[PDB]
Amino acid sequence: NLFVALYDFVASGDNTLSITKGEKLRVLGYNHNGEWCEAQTKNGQGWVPSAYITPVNS
């Protein structure tokens, strides 16, 4: 469950989390439709787009 951000995403409220391209993140789970996933980084925790991340070392 260790992942890397592919693109920049800026948080928009509703418990979303900003992520920076190249940042590593731990994934805690997904929403009903897979589109959003709950991450933790060095800057905090929150929802990020699933399509914006990929596993490390694959």
Partner: peptide, 10 residues
Amino acid sequence: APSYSPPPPP
């Protein structure tokens, strides 16, 4: 999670 759509990859 948010009810709205996430933004498309840039």
